[PDB]
Amino acid sequence: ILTMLVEPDAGKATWVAASTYGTDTTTGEEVKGALKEIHFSTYKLAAKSFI
Amino acid sequence: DNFVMPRQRAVTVERERQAGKQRDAYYVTQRVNLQRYFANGVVSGTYAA
């Protein structure tokens, strides 16, 4: 099998405002993310002839 | 002469980059007291009651 990793889609930053300058929210909200995996695998074709 | 200021830390300033809050915090702390060697020594005045 082949399991390539797919990057997650983009997050959004949070536009903190003016009140939240000294508060712990001055850094916004976490841009969490997680990779996702795709799995590559092969099925089989066969045939036979006898002469 | 009866009073001494027992020290222990002098004004000391420390900066913590808070980071999270973007703030930078400065902390000035000192430990000190006024104590009298002996109990007698000061007399104060008062406006009347």
Side-chain angles (χ1 to χ4, degrees), chain B:
Chain B
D1 300 336
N2 198 38
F3 299 80
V4 267
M5 279 168 46
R7 207 150 269 278
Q8 215 171 25
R9 197 186 327 188
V11 257
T12 34
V13 193
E14 182 188 348
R15 171 180 180 269
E16 192 205 353
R17 177 46 202 258
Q18 223 98 150
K21 326 217 204 165
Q22 230 78 13
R23 275 181 335 197
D24 309 6
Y26 291 91
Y27 298 118
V28 182
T29 37
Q30 155 187 79
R31 302 230 274 158
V32 65
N33 196 355
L34 227 183
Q35 294 225 6
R36 25 152 91 276
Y37 272 134
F38 288 104
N40 15 256
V42 45
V43 40
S44 65
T46 97
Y47 290 92

Side-chain angles (χ1 to χ4, degrees), chain A residues 21-22 24 26-27, chain B residues 19-23:
Chain A
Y21 272 165
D24 229 317
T26 180
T27 23
Chain B
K21 326 217 204 165
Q22 230 78 13
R23 275 181 335 197

Side-chain angles (χ1 to χ4, degrees), chain A residues 1-40:
Chain A
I1 301 185
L2 213 119
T3 146
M4 335 205 70
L5 294 159
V6 170
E7 213 170 340
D9 10 56
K12 285 195 195 290
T14 333
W15 295 74
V16 321
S19 56
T20 51
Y21 272 165
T23 10
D24 229 317
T25 338
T26 180
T27 23
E29 282 178 357
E30 191 163 359
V31 187
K32 259 168 180 166
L35 326 96
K36 286 136 188 170
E37 320 168 15
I38 48 165
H39 303 76
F40 286 148

